[PDB]
A paper describes a structure:
Here, we report that (p)ppGpp inhibits the signal recognition particle (SRP)-dependent protein targeting pathway, which is essential for membrane protein biogenesis and protein secretion. Briefly, SRP recognizes hydrophobic signal sequences in the context of translating ribosomes, and SRP bound to ribosome-nascent chain complexes (RNCs) in turn interacts in a GTP-dependent manner with its receptor FtsY, also a GTPase, which localizes at the cytoplasmic membrane periphery of bacteria via a membrane-targeting sequence.
The (Bs)Ffh-NG domain also bound ppGpp and pppGpp with similar affinities as their GDP and GTP counterparts, respectively. In detail, the guanine moiety of (p)ppGpp is recognized by the well-described aspartate of the G4 element responsible for the discrimination of guanosine nucleotides by P-loop type GTPases. The δ- and ε-phosphate, which are covalently bound to the 3′-OH group of the ribose moiety and discriminate (p)ppGpp from its GDP/GTP counterparts, point away from the active sites of both GTPases. Both phosphates are not coordinated or form any obvious contacts to the GTPases of Ffh and FtsY. The missing coordination leads to a high flexibility of the δ- and ε-phosphate, as observed in the crystals of (Ec)Ffh with pppGpp.
Numbering used by the authors: 1 to 300
Write the structure that this text describes.
């Protein structure tokens, strides 16, 4: 899934280049004003679009136009290459701690998909990597937040560590990680708290949890359909504590892809996984070249 609208807007511009055997410099400029326009309408950060247009234009008006064995193929290769680089190049794999367990801290705003993604990530870790993960209920403030995560764990046959809602998340994380050491769990996934907007009470708690958990990974969970808002959430989260990755949720509803194309360029935090639905299997690793190909109508 993902990017359906941007691909539709770019189909004519790109295909016109693909269908010709000689690309003039006026053709590349004409393609580039329409590519610029499509990226801006897809809510890509406008400074990212500016840098992207210049980088592609400088390379496109080069050896590619003058060599005519496949001039059109070369204009498209550069766009694919630059789209791939923009989104991170190669897939960004989950880190493995030197001493187990590997502790993964899930953070984000309410409604972004934290709790659901924590279950998805555990499921993915056991299936694709044959690890033994433990889930942790560290969101005490919202009722049914614990029972929701427990209900997910009861579908995965995976433990969900909880001490109720009368106990600090700092203490819950401390006990969970130290139980995980004793019983040889590979991964610990902390489902943390969060309201609708960032506040001081939230970073203080998250800073304290990071302090005692000393996590190998801190993943922001953020809603892909919120566009530039998601890019701003990542910037704040990355500067007030340290983000190591991003999970983009609800691409099954994101036709534009602005956040997907903007987050790494603005924050330097890589996007590691994409959420693609409500079910626990709906999580795939973020592959930048495949996304670039899906953007150019080159999908498998
Ligand atoms: N389609 C889709 N949906 C996702 C994905 N990830 C999460 N969701 C939805 O987002 C909503 C919030 O998920 P939570 O896991 O409760 O998020 P939170 O902990 O950050 O609050 C849930 O819907 P809800 O609370 O039942 O309803 P609503 O909030 O959507 O109205 C869930 O179904 C995804 O990858 N694709
Ligand atoms: Mg939640």
């Amino acid at each position: 899934m993902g990017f359906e609208g941007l691909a539709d807007r770019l189909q004519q511009t790109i295909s016109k280049i693909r269908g010709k055997g000689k690309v003039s410099e006026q053709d590349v400029k004409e393609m580039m004003r329409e590519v610029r326009l499509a990226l801006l309408e897809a809510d890509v950060n406008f400074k990212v679009v500016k840098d992207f247009v210049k980088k592609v234009s400088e390379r496109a008006v080069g050896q590619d136009v003058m060599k005519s064995l496949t001039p059109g193929q070369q204009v498209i290769k550069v766009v694919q290459e630059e789209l791939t680089e923009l989104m991170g190049g190669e897939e960004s794999k989950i880190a493995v701690a030197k001493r187990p367990p590997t502790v993964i801290m899930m953070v984000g705003l309410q409604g972004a998909g934290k709790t659901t993604t924590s279950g998805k990530l555990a499921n993915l870790l056991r299936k694709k990597h044959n690890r033994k993960p433990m889930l942790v209920a560290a969101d005490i403030y919202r009722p049914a937040a614990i029972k929701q995560l427990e209900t997910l764990g009861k579908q995965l046959d995976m433990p969900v560590f909880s001490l109720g809602d009368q106990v600090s998340p700092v203490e819950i994380a401390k006990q969970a990680i130290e139980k995980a050491k004793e019983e040889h769990y590979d991964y610990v996934i902390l489902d943390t708290a969060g309201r609708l907007h960032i506040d001081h009470e939230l970073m203080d708690e998250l800073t304290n949890v990071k302090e005692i958990a000393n996590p190998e990974e801190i993943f922001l969970v953020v809603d892909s359909m919120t566009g530039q808002d998601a890019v701003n959430v990542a910037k704040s989260f990355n500067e007030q504590l340290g983000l190591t990755g991003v999970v983009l949720t609800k691409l099954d509803g994101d036709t534009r892809g602005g956040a997907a194309l903007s987050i790494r360029a603005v924050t330097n935090t890589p996007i590691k996984f994409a959420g693609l639905g409500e079910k626990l299997d709906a999580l795939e690793p973020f592959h930048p070249e495949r996304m670039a190909s899906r953007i150019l109508g080159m999908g498998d």
